Amino acid sequence: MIQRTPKIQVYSRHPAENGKSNFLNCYVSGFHPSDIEVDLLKNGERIEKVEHSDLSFSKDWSFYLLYYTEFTPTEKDEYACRVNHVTLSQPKIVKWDRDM
């Protein structure tokens, strides 16, 4: 059966400003089937309080989800999204770049 790989984007709800509350997003889309593991990471470790949107799909049947959590950016803290899916031979990690 059809297996499509997730596209992944990691980004903030508002433009990041150090010290100001925000949300960290990991948007996964374009994927099939729907079973997907998404973790947000703060300095390499799993953030526990992470929520997600309700599973939906695009005109081409491929799924999308938004994972998110509240965060306050700093100059030092590094954030990432770590994704596993049947299409990925190992978990894919995408670093948050405050300009992407």
The residue ranges that bind another protein (CB under 8 A) are 1-4, 7, 9, 11, 13, 15, 23, 25, 27, 29-30, 32-35, 53-57, 61-63, 66, 68, 99-100
Task: Choose between 32 and 82: whose C-beta lies nearer to another protein.
Answer: 32
Task: Choose between 59 and 76: whose C-beta lies nearer to another protein.
Answer: 59
Closest to 36 measured CA to CA, from 26, 44, 46? 26
Task: Choose between 44 and 63: whose C-beta lies nearer to another protein.
Answer: 63
At its nearest, how many Å lie between another protein and the CB of residue 12? 9
Closest to 81 measured CA to CA, from 30, 19, 36, 27? 27
Q: Where are the alpha helices (DSSP H) in the chain?
A: none
Question: Any idea what DSSP says for residue 91?
Answer: -
At its nearest, how many Å lie between another protein and the CB of residue 61? 4
d(C-alpha 95, C-alpha 40), whole Å: 10
